[PDB]
Amino acid sequence: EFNILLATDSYKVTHYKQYPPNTSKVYSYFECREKKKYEETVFYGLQYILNKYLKGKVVTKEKIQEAKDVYKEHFQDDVFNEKGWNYILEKYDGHLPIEIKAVPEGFVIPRGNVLFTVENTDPECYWLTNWIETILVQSWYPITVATNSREQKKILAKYLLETSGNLDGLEYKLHDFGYRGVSSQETAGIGASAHLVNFKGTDTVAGLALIKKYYGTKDPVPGYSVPAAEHSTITAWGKDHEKDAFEHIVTQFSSVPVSVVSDSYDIYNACEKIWGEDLRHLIVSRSTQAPLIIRPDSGNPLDTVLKVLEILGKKFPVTENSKGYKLLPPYLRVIQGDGVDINTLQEIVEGMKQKMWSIENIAFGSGGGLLQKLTRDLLNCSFKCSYVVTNGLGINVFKDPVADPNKRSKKGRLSLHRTPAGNFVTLEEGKGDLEEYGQDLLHTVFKNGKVTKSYSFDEIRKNAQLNIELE
Amino acid sequence: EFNILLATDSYKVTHYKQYPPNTSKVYSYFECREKVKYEETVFYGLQYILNKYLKGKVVTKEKIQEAKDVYKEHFQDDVFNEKGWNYILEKYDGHLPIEIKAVPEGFVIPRGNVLFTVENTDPECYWLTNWIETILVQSWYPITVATNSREQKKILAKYLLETSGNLDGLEYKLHDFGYRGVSSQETAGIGASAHLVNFKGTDTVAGLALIKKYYGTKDPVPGYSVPAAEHSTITAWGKDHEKDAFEHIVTQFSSVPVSVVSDSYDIYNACEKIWGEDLRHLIVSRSTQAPLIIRPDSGNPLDTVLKVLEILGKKFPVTENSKGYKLLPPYLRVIQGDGVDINTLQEIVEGMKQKMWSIENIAFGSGGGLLQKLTRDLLNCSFKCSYVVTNGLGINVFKDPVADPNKRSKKGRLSLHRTPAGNFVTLEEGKGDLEEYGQDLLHTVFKNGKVTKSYSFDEIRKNAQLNIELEAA
Ligand SMILES: Nc1ccc(CNC(=O)Nc2ccc(S(=O)(=O)c3ccccc3)cc2)cn1
Ligand SMILES: Nc1ccc(CNC(=O)Nc2ccc(S(=O)(=O)c3ccccc3)cc2)cn1
Q: Which residues bind beta-nicotinamide D-ribonucleotide (chain A)?
């Protein structure tokens, strides 16, 4: 069972003896710190953490004794605030006397703005605020995935619109392939759900259960997929029977969309000779609602995609759309699901546009690039203390390393507001109390063990929409 | 609760309709596929996966119905193999008819060798082999962390030995700071435990319980830490009271080691004026078993470390060790825990060496670089089918993309052997049965729902030792 007393950085166990004596309050905030591009971020993932790890009775006699035993060996010393945790158990029935206020999930906020604040509600629990920093900071991941996924959506929207004249099916242009490529099962579900903020296609099943349990959607499921082959279902037929493999698979899935990896031995042979001649008759008869999706999986992503399109373009009836770009027949599409990150995605669609190929023809699958190749310093997700009350006096506190002005933190009590021009601004030093900037955008989402405000995955998707989608 | 039927890539749900008819066997393997660095990998993490996810009754009536309902909406169609999973439930009481053979955990194996193999033990469950691919491929992470952590230990060993003459305290030279920097709680435990294969210092507590539960050690805990400050325990005192903060903290932890982050406002001022002058009397009186550890946390890592060292060098009695390198007094040490990955680590220790500073003086803390900034691409961890039996005929299968020879996979039944020179070699096409390379070094670790072989964390650590560590005496 999960023990909150064992879910923090080791050194934080000793922090209760380090704060100034007579401190009744520690007030801390979280931000995606600005750097001297990712200029805006999707806030998402906190609600998962609040429900799974923070709410309800999270402190028991056993969990205190368990932590006491581990830390005694871990530090080779008795440093442990047993009295502090005992107080929470006896006074609040193990509920955390903590208040968390946050911007609504799905909200797109520019860098350098307060996203959520944390403070203690009982003077005795001044130390508790930063105890849970570690677990709260891990919200960097769904934030970063949601943000990076959305930035890829912008690129896709831009080129799809320019080459086709609309945004039909945009929410299916980036498919999640990252299940095997992430660090754990929990990460898989969290990352997949963050991608589903922007798109509807995934193969990381674990994301669906997470969303249903912690967020919920009106639709039965927030994510979908199509039948598809892997290298094993092709190669098992033997080197000389790749055509037999292809034919068997498209026949088994003739009434639904089907993706078939075609690079097992020779991708260019498979497209031109096998799909393009030998099995062409099984392709041109397929429904528009059930196309074949050819899937390359090796070589230079841009060069391979272009050559595949070039090959298919001469074996299948190609039309030219109203924008002047070439379009494959509705029964034939391509997915590039290898080597795809935000960088190569940009290079590929730009490369396609150069060769007069519409983005209608292609979709992208991304695994490690989508869910794993991301870190905390990408958006500079940081948790810092900005306000304390010592001896009854409030103090505006901050860090400001001389050798790195970028790591400077904000001072005092914070609030997030709309600017007159409709942008965002974070007010420091409690200046939000002057009420010159309208209502604080931060809402109490957690207080004293209870989740006080929630959001459905539907609301979140609404909030995180692209401007071009709104227009 | 965990549902193994819902713990695979979506398209694998449709794969049982795609294999050649009358296929009774699917046999697959796992390798860190070959391509100058990371030439050998530490195999670790599979035992965790086997116990937490694969062993015992992992199939129930409810889990089948649950998966059925999800996939129906997920695919907008009914492609779920309900009959297949029912067979497993009815015939084997939910236990997976799978055999897994694997190299011992902790073992150090060169790239391009078979690390583990998977095959179905029931002809009916031919589809089961690659269903669990996704869940097994995730072992890439503890493999990659342990490997990357060990490569850093090599760097540390080299420079510590050269600057000091020995390797005393090497296992504490790289500390885990990555709890907040990973993608989840589970990842935190898995990653931290992987680091602990090579070192003993961690702040990621979640690693301890994982090891105790799934691996075990003779000692009460596999990892240790020391009292330390964060910026909040310094800045809360106020801008003009950094000295008071320092003094309070070192006094509270006067008889134990204590790390104190010193860059809140001015790292160079804190080292020279506050530590080096104002509170000097509180530092030189400290025990050798309870030193102050000064912690910079900003600026260019190499430049900052050298400057901090030069500053302390002129404020404290520095000695020169037997190798001719400068050494801080035993009550004073430094940890650099910002911007540390395998590349910057190398740059720092080399820079220290050129300035005649011993690696005895310093230790490193690493967070995102140690536990998060890693992918499956790094060691090319890959799972591939190499052998099937269809119509009673065994077929050696493989992929070999025309545009990427590096993605070529191995053929047929695999086995791992010792060469006459004592190296590793992977034999393909069932050639291991020729008995020219002796016995298969793989062990059956999982069979029919039961873990058949396992390793304590102590033995895993022993297996993962460095050659330089083994050279004794
Ligand atoms: N890890 C993994 C998982 C799975 C795979 C292989 N599956 C795979 O490619 N599926 C796939 C393909 C295409 C599209 S689509 O383009 O959105 C599309 C959808 C419907 C109709 C037309 C087009 C969606 C899904 C590889 N690796
Ligand atoms: N995420 C996190 C966690 C924690 C921190 C700050 N804690 C921290 O630096 N601890 C620390 C310091 C030094 C050493 S040591 O050098 O191995 C050492 C050990 C004993 C005696 C002498 C020397 C080990 C641990 C930052 N970030």
A: 203, 295-297, 337-338, 368, 376
